[PDB]
Write a protein that binds this ligand. Structure first.
Ligand SMILES: O=C(NCC(F)(F)F)N1CCN(C(=O)c2ccc(Cl)o2)CC1
Length: 119
């Protein structure tokens, strides 16, 4: 029932994500000289450095907010991909499965801790 524990849990999960080869396309923003049309399609960019920085700044209030931003990384990849069989998109799907597998307990524990706080 520790309503702060999610923050270190998210830091550790982000550390795992940065160690994963599949995260490499998603660790920083998109060079427009490499993907000129990127910001025609994607009006709300997100990457794992921005998520980590937002967390470390104290600018997430809950793991739900962090989860929203991580999911935006994946939805951006799905929206920008020219194909379901794109290498970078395929990396996004594996990393998303890994992230969802790990964030599930963080969200459950936070929400349970907040319900106990308000009991
Ligand atoms: O350029 C980058 N990342 C920045 C880096 F290269 F510095 F790491 N991306 C390429 C475009 N992105 C996609 O999600 C995507 C889906 C299908 C195809 Cl193709 O791209 C985002 C990641």
């Amino acid at each position: 029932y520790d309503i702060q524990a999610w923050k270190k849990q998210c830091e550790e999960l982000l550390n795992l994500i940065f160690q994963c080869e599949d995260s490499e396309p998603f660790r920083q923003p998109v060079d427009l000289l490499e993907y000129p049309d990127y910001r025609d399609i994607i009006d709300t960019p997100m990457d794992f450095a921005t998520v980590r920085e937002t967390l470390e700044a104290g600018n997430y209030e809950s793991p739900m907010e962090l989860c929203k931003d991580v999911r935006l990384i994946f939805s951006n990849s799905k929206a920008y991909t020219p194909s379901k069989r794109s290498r970078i998109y395929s990396m996004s799907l594996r990393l998303s499965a890994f992230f969802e597998e790990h964030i599930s307990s963080v969200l459950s524990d936070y929400k349970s801790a907040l319900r106990f706080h308000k009991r």
